[PDB]
RNA sequence: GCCCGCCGCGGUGCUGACGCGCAGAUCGCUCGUCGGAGCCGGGCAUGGGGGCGAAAGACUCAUCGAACCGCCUGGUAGCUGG
RNA sequence: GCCCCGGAGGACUGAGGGGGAGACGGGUUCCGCGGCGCCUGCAUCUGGCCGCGGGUGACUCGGGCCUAAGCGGCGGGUGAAGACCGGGAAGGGGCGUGCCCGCCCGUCGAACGGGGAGCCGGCGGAGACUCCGGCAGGCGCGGGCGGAGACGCGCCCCCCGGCGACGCGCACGGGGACCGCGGCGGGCGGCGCCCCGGCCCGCGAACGCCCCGCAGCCCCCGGACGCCUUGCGCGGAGAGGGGGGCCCGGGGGCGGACCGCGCGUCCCCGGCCGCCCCUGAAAAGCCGGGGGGCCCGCGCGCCGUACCGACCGCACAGGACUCCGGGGUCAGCAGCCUCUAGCGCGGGAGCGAACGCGGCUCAGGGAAGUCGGCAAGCCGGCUCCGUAACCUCGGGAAAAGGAGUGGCUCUGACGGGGUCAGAACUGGAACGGACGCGGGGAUCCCGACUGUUUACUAGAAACACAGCGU
């Protein structure tokens, strides 16, 4: 909606910011083979209830 | 940068809990200059952006340069 | 079964009265010091239609008797009352349509309306459009007055109960047929959720004691006794007799 | 914005109520910028001569033609 | 050409305080301009008719002199209602006393 | 009807016809007596004579 | 030229509702659309505004009356009997 | 609470299409109604043997001659399968 | 050269839009650059997909405030409790001490109701009533007279009032915007013949001052067989006539800064009239009355603001509120064609079998077919003629049946404008030439009628209904 409360805006803002890949130097640093962050989401198939 | 060369305005990130009157006073005490008007918004990520226009007899180039902004 | 329609109306919600945009409760003027020792003068300000009510109402302004300013009353209008008229309330008021007098001071034969069944209660009898009470006789030694109610019953009230002279305006309202289902819809939309009505024999047995059967029919007598329990007390309750016949006098 | 009779024009000048004057050639337009309103007077060039000489020396004048 | 415009207000629900008119701008464009509701002027306390002399503007925007009439009960009674109060007062004094 | 009233009023004002003639023809116009403007101008001549 | 023979103002109803109802409405509806006499104006300009409420369009006075006529016959008799009872109270 | 008819609101017949669907009820043509007991949006109220019903045992989030969720509960079976 | 991009051609959506924008829901899908591993049911160099950078600025718009239907709270009351129910309670303010006044909740509940005040031009890859320039408006803070009259020209408390503030309707009238025709100024196109006959562009806001404003209500003289509407309506409780006052979302002139004339359409407003056993919110806030006591400066905080039918149906011919609405034909917001704007829809090519699905035509006969005229066909616009039984006298009724209708050249009627009426001539013996658009009649049963229902196999004779009765 274009008319949203600041409290809903802030919780939506955090899901946008943390929706990221693992950095590549972290993959070298921590010696990882699983490289996908499975807590990511995509707007077409998500149901963020926030 | 276009904002400073014309319109004499500097764009800053500030703590979300600050109002326009607290922003004007802070900028005037830290950079030793004269503010004219402050616009603000909260970005889609949660930060606060301030549009700070300096007084019509001050060059924000002279003030952005001393700060490093250029 | 389930709870029947008459059992669901006592709980409130969709069966509460439609009181929005009503003018207020209609009452006589409160009995006070000045009215007991004399009479107080008011002036008719407006004649107004009240939602859900057949007779009209009147706004009457009286002076403040315990301070400065005015006091505004809401009366049920006797027929013949008109804007700008001067009315009177008290023991010394005269016999004119619109005045409020103790029923002991009113001569026998008079038409009155909005009568108190106990003193100072502010009026509860003969309030509907076209109705009136008669003053039948005075019993001075016991301080009681005899009146005839709109049903034809007789009753004894105190002689210090008050009344308004005249009969209620709006009379003859029921003599016009409602022609259409739509005129009935508009009448009850201003009162209550009580219309339209579905017959008990048109229902299933779970819904009503009259429901079911391969032909629509009640099955037993529809005279039920006075001590029947809720959910059971449908049809004709405690009927002395039934059927259509003349000869009553 | 509003128009003005010539005599009122100098008095606003005489009390230092003007901030800038502009002379416009077309009948000449004289526009005076006060705190509240912009005022406009139309005169022929013959008439505007004398008025500008009376022009308050504390009142900046500019010209304009094209 | 094509002269269709979009809505000017926060929502498009066309209530009685969201009516516009249309006007052509100096840049050759069709603009929308709100049409304010016009309040009534004050009405007589005895007769319910418009009081003469007061413009249909909310009194916050009218100077003090513009909001008044120069007579006893200036903006309360319509002039005829005053004359009837004056006669009733004077004549009742003449009948409640000296017969 | 606007045409016939506009003509009838013009005459009364100029005193071509009086007020009692004006009012009689005013009612005849309202009752569909004259089909156009020419017919009313003869009735006016014929009543005056 | 007369446009109906019997139905009068109930021609607005068409063929609906039966003869006995339309007969009742012709009398009732003729009565409530009528012009009555101001008891004060003395002019014939009283019209109904709601059930029980009658206003002179010349006096501007407002009056309380019957549902479909200005005066009812019960109220005429009541006013007549009440008046005689007051005058009898006078010695 | 008149008649023909557009949007809208509804859903008659073809027992047409589809029936491993476009679809866990849709599509085509035809059809009822269209100033009224008319249609639509938001807010608010009524809670399970209870509600709500112009009454079909209808509707109450694909659930109704008694909703849904967890537990009592690995409920009991002279009956079917192994 | 890919279904992407460009140029040229051919078409479509068809102003209730496959157009331009909001509300709700979604949440970064928005923008620029790169890219094809996944997805884009065919392909891809495309993309709402993947990587990397960015992006939403308000005194005037909305939210914050007010109250609606409601919902909470309330000395207490009740119940084993959880909890549920509630006015009968020593219920707070102004100041300045000290006096005085006072009956008793809610800074809960509307991003459509109420509400102090914003317009034009310009700039960017993505924001604008928010930025920049210009011109204004609102709320704050600091440096007793004139008139015959209608009427004209600082405050505080108590009381009385006002504004806020309100239904529906066929019509009639006025303004704005739109739309056309003609002139004149500038530019285009095509051109076998004709063409001063085709196309595009000719723009002016909020706000301030002056003038002008029909209806409607008011004042003065004076004393009546009239004034006047499409309709009405009004007058000795003072008409007409003569001269005035007030209101009027409007118009003009000067500021801000090309010229005429018309039929309609939409939107708002006006005065009337009709209708109801229906009579069509409240409050904050702001103002008046009666009585008593007494120019120049500065500022305006907090939150929303990108984009989308990218929403719900496991992703999808379903479902999903509102705003703006050109031209021709026409009774028209119908059908059919179109200017502006916009351009997807799990992919292509070949062949022209059966059989299906949606369509078309058929000699002669005309329901013999079938449970049954199911399906299909006939009728249909407008004008004139002509219309029965029966009836609750309103209907039946478009009953049934007939005739005319193009093009061209003209004539008459109404006070510049379309309509209505008539005639000559002419064409396969044609004309509502597409489109749109009743088949009719004689009867019997049931229910009086409009209305309601088994969402998803039943729309009815079932339910409801006015009336009648207990
Ligand atoms: K947004
Ligand atoms: K989503
Ligand atoms: K039960
Ligand atoms: K039960
Ligand atoms: K029961
Ligand atoms: K029940
Ligand atoms: K009901
Ligand atoms: K019933
Ligand atoms: K039964
Ligand atoms: K339809
Ligand atoms: K088939
Ligand atoms: K369907
Ligand atoms: K109709
Ligand atoms: K209940
Ligand atoms: K419930
Ligand atoms: K249950
Ligand atoms: K259960
Ligand atoms: K369970
Ligand atoms: K348990
Ligand atoms: K068992
Ligand atoms: K068993
Ligand atoms: K088994
Ligand atoms: K790319
Ligand atoms: K207890
Ligand atoms: K309790
Ligand atoms: K609220
Ligand atoms: K609302
Ligand atoms: K609001
Ligand atoms: K309101
Ligand atoms: K007063
Ligand atoms: K924005
Ligand atoms: K083949
Ligand atoms: K075959
Ligand atoms: K047959
Ligand atoms: K058929
Ligand atoms: K012809
Ligand atoms: K039926
Ligand atoms: K109907
Ligand atoms: K079925
Ligand atoms: K059904
Ligand atoms: K049906
Ligand atoms: K039924
Ligand atoms: Mg902001
Ligand atoms: Mg049944
Ligand atoms: Mg039972
Ligand atoms: Mg109808
Ligand atoms: Mg119909
Ligand atoms: Mg089928
Ligand atoms: Mg169990
Ligand atoms: Mg088990
Ligand atoms: Mg097309
Ligand atoms: Mg993109
Ligand atoms: Mg593919
Ligand atoms: Mg505002
Ligand atoms: Mg609140
Ligand atoms: Mg609002
Ligand atoms: Mg944008
Ligand atoms: Mg309202
Ligand atoms: Mg936007
Ligand atoms: Mg054949
Ligand atoms: Mg046969
Ligand atoms: Mg056979
Ligand atoms: Mg029926
Ligand atoms: Mg029906
Ligand atoms: Mg079904
Ligand atoms: Mg069906």
Tab-separated table of C-alpha atoms (C1' of nucleotides) in Angstrom, chain I residues 92-369:
chain	number	residue	atom	x	y	z
I	92	G	C1'	-12.158	20.200	39.024
I	93	G	C1'	-11.286	24.501	37.454
I	94	G	C1'	-10.016	29.976	37.082
I	95	C	C1'	-6.656	32.663	38.818
I	96	G	C1'	-2.816	36.190	42.165
I	97	U	C1'	-2.469	35.540	47.565
I	98	G	C1'	-6.889	34.531	48.623
I	99	C	C1'	-11.527	34.290	47.041
I	100	C	C1'	-14.905	32.864	43.579
I	101	C	C1'	-17.483	29.144	40.079
I	102	G	C1'	-18.751	23.917	39.565
I	103	C	C1'	-23.166	16.872	39.276
I	104	C	C1'	-21.017	12.455	37.017
I	105	C	C1'	-15.603	9.396	31.713
I	106	G	C1'	-12.448	8.445	27.094
I	107	U	C1'	-5.757	13.101	23.186
I	108	C	C1'	-10.657	4.759	21.686
I	109	G	C1'	-13.689	4.285	16.850
I	110	A	C1'	-13.686	7.232	9.358
I	111	A	C1'	-6.175	7.614	4.776
I	112	C	C1'	-14.656	8.157	1.160
I	113	G	C1'	-18.235	11.902	6.426
I	114	G	C1'	-16.746	17.318	9.419
I	115	G	C1'	-11.948	20.145	8.699
I	116	G	C1'	-7.871	27.490	8.618
I	117	A	C1'	-5.040	28.029	4.005
I	118	G	C1'	-1.867	26.658	-3.286
I	119	C	C1'	-1.666	28.257	-8.278
I	120	C	C1'	1.383	28.703	-12.907
I	121	G	C1'	6.208	27.712	-15.531
I	122	G	C1'	10.532	24.920	-15.499
I	123	C	C1'	14.476	20.984	-14.419
I	124	G	C1'	15.921	14.777	-13.714
I	125	G	C1'	17.661	7.738	-15.535
I	126	A	C1'	14.156	6.711	-11.539
I	127	G	C1'	10.520	12.026	-7.076
I	128	A	C1'	6.965	16.239	-7.398
I	129	C	C1'	0.084	20.100	-5.513
I	130	U	C1'	6.610	18.096	-1.957
I	131	C	C1'	12.441	20.255	-5.732
I	132	C	C1'	13.954	25.375	-8.303
I	133	G	C1'	12.087	30.255	-10.038
I	134	G	C1'	7.897	33.369	-9.812
I	135	C	C1'	3.107	35.035	-7.624
I	136	A	C1'	-0.112	34.354	-3.357
I	137	G	C1'	-2.871	32.505	1.037
I	138	G	C1'	-3.372	30.685	6.399
I	139	C	C1'	-1.978	30.421	11.720
I	140	G	C1'	1.225	32.437	15.196
I	141	C	C1'	5.271	35.291	17.674
I	142	G	C1'	8.457	39.829	18.465
I	143	G	C1'	9.605	45.555	17.398
I	144	G	C1'	-18.442	56.289	17.068
I	145	C	C1'	-20.082	58.037	12.494
I	146	G	C1'	-23.646	58.481	7.814
I	147	G	C1'	-29.021	57.178	6.135
I	148	A	C1'	-36.189	58.488	5.968
I	149	G	C1'	-35.647	53.363	6.020
I	150	A	C1'	-34.058	48.327	4.298
I	151	C	C1'	-28.792	48.876	5.504
I	152	G	C1'	-23.730	51.411	4.860
I	153	C	C1'	-18.865	52.656	6.993
I	154	G	C1'	-10.303	45.178	22.148
I	155	C	C1'	-11.714	41.951	25.775
I	156	C	C1'	-13.878	38.792	29.943
I	157	C	C1'	-17.719	35.904	32.367
I	158	C	C1'	-23.401	34.169	32.478
I	159	C	C1'	-27.493	33.458	29.321
I	160	C	C1'	-29.937	33.271	24.106
I	161	G	C1'	-28.864	32.078	19.108
I	162	G	C1'	-25.967	31.058	14.379
I	163	C	C1'	-22.518	28.430	10.951
I	164	G	C1'	-20.607	23.639	10.646
I	165	A	C1'	-25.425	20.631	8.707
I	166	C	C1'	-27.383	17.310	5.079
I	167	G	C1'	-33.655	12.887	1.245
I	168	C	C1'	-35.616	11.689	-3.483
I	169	G	C1'	-37.760	13.099	-8.500
I	170	C	C1'	-39.764	14.346	-14.217
I	171	A	C1'	-38.975	18.993	-16.027
I	172	C	C1'	-37.405	24.370	-16.765
I	173	G	C1'	-33.426	28.209	-16.389
I	174	G	C1'	-27.924	30.185	-15.871
I	175	G	C1'	-22.559	29.367	-15.913
I	176	G	C1'	-18.188	26.536	-17.048
I	177	A	C1'	-15.635	22.756	-19.911
I	178	C	C1'	-16.117	20.011	-24.202
I	179	C	C1'	-17.746	19.908	-29.338
I	180	G	C1'	-18.739	21.870	-34.271
I	181	C	C1'	-19.191	25.800	-38.741
I	182	G	C1'	-17.010	30.270	-41.046
I	183	G	C1'	-13.168	33.897	-41.397
I	184	C	C1'	-8.091	35.319	-41.272
I	185	G	C1'	-2.394	34.072	-40.036
I	186	G	C1'	1.738	30.172	-40.257
I	187	G	C1'	2.925	25.216	-41.852
I	188	C	C1'	1.905	20.246	-44.595
I	189	G	C1'	0.191	16.330	-48.068
I	190	G	C1'	-1.157	14.121	-52.534
I	191	C	C1'	-2.165	15.641	-57.351
I	192	G	C1'	-4.557	10.678	-64.361
I	193	C	C1'	-8.810	14.753	-64.216
I	194	C	C1'	-11.099	18.349	-60.127
I	195	C	C1'	-9.505	21.382	-55.904
I	196	C	C1'	-9.772	29.174	-52.434
I	197	G	C1'	-13.535	21.555	-51.196
I	198	G	C1'	-8.029	17.473	-47.413
I	199	C	C1'	-4.864	17.643	-42.748
I	200	C	C1'	-1.963	20.025	-38.313
I	201	C	C1'	-1.086	24.558	-35.082
I	202	G	C1'	-3.218	29.599	-33.493
I	203	C	C1'	-2.389	29.191	-25.711
I	204	G	C1'	-3.761	32.570	-20.446
I	205	A	C1'	-4.038	29.773	-13.698
I	206	A	C1'	-4.544	30.768	-8.243
I	207	C	C1'	-4.877	35.510	-6.165
I	208	G	C1'	-5.930	41.495	-5.487
I	209	C	C1'	-8.934	45.904	-6.899
I	210	C	C1'	-13.188	48.178	-9.602
I	211	C	C1'	-17.755	47.238	-12.294
I	212	C	C1'	-21.998	44.006	-13.727
I	213	G	C1'	-25.310	39.932	-12.032
I	214	C	C1'	-31.870	36.554	-13.578
I	215	A	C1'	-34.661	34.295	-9.770
I	216	G	C1'	-35.395	35.220	-4.276
I	217	C	C1'	-36.061	37.939	0.309
I	218	C	C1'	-36.480	43.257	2.259
I	219	C	C1'	-37.444	49.254	2.418
I	220	C	C1'	-40.238	54.057	0.881
I	221	C	C1'	-44.562	56.509	-1.438
I	222	G	C1'	-49.528	55.060	-2.209
I	223	G	C1'	-54.111	52.521	-2.007
I	224	A	C1'	-56.039	48.314	-6.130
I	225	C	C1'	-61.110	43.963	-11.437
I	226	G	C1'	-54.435	43.269	-11.948
I	227	C	C1'	-49.265	40.833	-12.070
I	228	C	C1'	-47.275	36.396	-13.909
I	229	U	C1'	-44.991	30.682	-14.968
I	230	U	C1'	-43.273	25.336	-19.577
I	231	G	C1'	-46.103	24.076	-14.951
I	232	C	C1'	-47.630	27.284	-11.209
I	233	G	C1'	-48.088	30.986	-7.987
I	234	C	C1'	-49.194	36.040	-5.507
I	235	G	C1'	-52.074	40.581	-3.520
I	236	G	C1'	-56.136	45.329	2.021
I	237	A	C1'	-51.665	40.566	6.921
I	238	G	C1'	-50.977	46.160	1.038
I	239	A	C1'	-50.926	44.207	-5.717
I	240	G	C1'	-49.303	46.930	-10.063
I	241	G	C1'	-46.282	51.395	-11.257
I	242	G	C1'	-42.102	54.833	-9.890
I	243	G	C1'	-37.260	54.864	-6.905
I	244	G	C1'	-34.057	51.825	-3.629
I	245	G	C1'	-31.254	47.749	-0.017
I	246	C	C1'	-29.042	42.475	0.733
I	247	C	C1'	-27.563	37.543	-1.012
I	248	C	C1'	-25.953	35.193	-5.453
I	249	G	C1'	-19.617	28.454	-6.040
I	250	G	C1'	-20.660	33.574	-11.933
I	251	G	C1'	-19.051	37.109	-15.828
I	252	G	C1'	-16.340	41.349	-17.380
I	253	G	C1'	-12.063	45.445	-17.279
I	254	C	C1'	-7.105	46.431	-15.244
I	255	G	C1'	-3.115	43.691	-12.981
I	256	G	C1'	-0.749	38.501	-12.593
I	257	A	C1'	1.476	38.468	-18.265
I	258	C	C1'	-6.262	36.115	-33.366
I	259	C	C1'	-11.744	37.291	-34.769
I	260	G	C1'	-17.222	35.829	-34.949
I	261	C	C1'	-21.808	32.455	-34.847
I	262	G	C1'	-24.298	27.918	-33.385
I	263	C	C1'	-27.029	22.583	-32.073
I	264	G	C1'	-25.996	19.363	-28.429
I	265	U	C1'	-23.329	16.622	-24.502
I	266	C	C1'	-21.456	16.224	-19.403
I	267	C	C1'	-20.701	18.694	-14.521
I	268	C	C1'	-22.249	22.020	-10.865
I	269	C	C1'	-25.641	25.746	-9.269
I	270	G	C1'	-31.050	28.402	-8.991
I	271	G	C1'	-36.207	29.181	-8.182
I	272	C	C1'	-40.409	26.341	-8.074
I	273	C	C1'	-43.524	21.985	-8.008
I	274	G	C1'	-44.507	16.768	-6.643
I	275	C	C1'	-43.783	12.519	-2.979
I	276	C	C1'	-43.781	9.581	2.359
I	277	C	C1'	-48.130	5.046	8.379
I	278	C	C1'	-40.245	6.459	4.900
I	279	U	C1'	-39.408	13.187	6.709
I	280	G	C1'	-33.668	11.962	5.030
I	281	A	C1'	-26.074	12.016	11.343
I	282	A	C1'	-23.139	13.990	15.173
I	283	A	C1'	-19.195	16.713	17.242
I	284	A	C1'	-14.576	19.577	17.286
I	285	G	C1'	-13.905	24.326	15.852
I	286	C	C1'	-15.368	29.421	14.654
I	287	C	C1'	-18.794	33.520	15.159
I	288	G	C1'	-22.947	37.006	16.588
I	289	G	C1'	-26.482	39.105	20.341
I	290	G	C1'	-28.364	40.745	25.351
I	291	G	C1'	-26.643	41.934	30.351
I	292	G	C1'	-22.623	43.013	33.637
I	293	G	C1'	-17.085	43.833	34.470
I	294	C	C1'	-13.435	46.142	32.003
I	295	C	C1'	3.812	49.205	9.060
I	296	C	C1'	8.384	46.249	9.602
I	297	G	C1'	10.694	41.466	11.004
I	298	C	C1'	10.849	36.149	12.525
I	299	G	C1'	8.594	31.027	12.573
I	300	C	C1'	5.487	26.708	11.200
I	301	G	C1'	7.710	20.412	14.656
I	302	C	C1'	5.993	14.410	13.818
I	303	C	C1'	4.489	10.333	10.050
I	304	G	C1'	3.034	8.545	4.529
I	305	U	C1'	4.885	9.622	-0.488
I	306	A	C1'	8.984	4.525	-5.702
I	307	C	C1'	6.065	1.084	-8.721
I	308	C	C1'	1.830	-2.475	-9.968
I	309	G	C1'	-4.401	-4.705	-11.182
I	310	A	C1'	3.435	-7.335	-9.964
I	311	C	C1'	-3.499	-8.776	-5.823
I	312	C	C1'	-6.540	-13.948	-4.136
I	313	G	C1'	-7.451	-18.672	-6.573
I	314	C	C1'	-0.643	-24.210	-5.049
I	315	A	C1'	1.110	-20.650	-11.376
I	316	C	C1'	-4.491	-19.630	-14.245
I	317	A	C1'	-10.275	-17.504	-20.279
I	318	G	C1'	-12.358	-17.111	-12.838
I	319	G	C1'	-12.825	-13.294	-8.906
I	320	A	C1'	-11.241	-8.002	-7.719
I	321	C	C1'	-14.094	-0.733	-5.439
I	322	U	C1'	-13.628	4.202	-7.759
I	323	C	C1'	-12.190	8.667	-11.242
I	324	C	C1'	-11.588	11.173	-16.537
I	325	G	C1'	-14.525	9.805	-21.422
I	326	G	C1'	-13.451	12.805	-28.784
I	327	G	C1'	-15.694	11.818	-34.234
I	328	G	C1'	-19.356	9.444	-38.076
I	329	U	C1'	-24.192	6.737	-38.575
I	330	C	C1'	-28.318	6.916	-34.795
I	331	A	C1'	-33.698	7.772	-30.325
I	332	G	C1'	-28.811	6.316	-28.041
I	333	C	C1'	-23.082	5.449	-22.885
I	334	A	C1'	-26.983	-0.088	-28.164
I	335	G	C1'	-24.544	-2.347	-32.792
I	336	C	C1'	-20.870	-1.310	-36.693
I	337	C	C1'	-16.296	1.889	-38.510
I	338	U	C1'	-12.680	5.522	-36.434
I	339	C	C1'	-8.650	10.447	-34.237
I	340	U	C1'	-5.672	10.542	-29.625
I	341	A	C1'	-2.960	6.783	-26.582
I	342	G	C1'	-1.437	1.641	-26.376
I	343	C	C1'	0.339	-2.321	-28.565
I	344	G	C1'	0.583	-10.272	-26.212
I	345	C	C1'	-2.111	-14.205	-26.249
I	346	G	C1'	2.837	-21.982	-23.499
I	347	G	C1'	6.069	-21.260	-30.860
I	348	G	C1'	6.144	-22.056	-36.236
I	349	A	C1'	5.635	-24.557	-41.353
I	350	G	C1'	3.071	-28.113	-44.773
I	351	C	C1'	-1.622	-30.768	-46.492
I	352	G	C1'	-6.671	-29.603	-47.739
I	353	A	C1'	-8.975	-37.615	-45.784
I	354	A	C1'	-12.734	-39.530	-42.333
I	355	C	C1'	-14.789	-37.583	-38.115
I	356	G	C1'	-15.747	-33.592	-34.714
I	357	C	C1'	-16.567	-28.170	-32.998
I	358	G	C1'	-18.459	-23.096	-34.641
I	359	G	C1'	-20.883	-21.396	-39.277
I	360	C	C1'	-23.683	-21.036	-44.659
I	361	U	C1'	-27.029	-22.673	-48.678
I	362	C	C1'	-30.533	-26.349	-50.451
I	363	A	C1'	-35.396	-28.668	-55.647
I	364	G	C1'	-40.589	-30.676	-54.375
I	365	G	C1'	-43.364	-31.383	-49.760
I	366	G	C1'	-44.279	-28.816	-44.882
I	367	A	C1'	-44.139	-31.655	-38.129
I	368	A	C1'	-45.506	-37.205	-41.723
I	369	G	C1'	-39.858	-36.565	-37.212
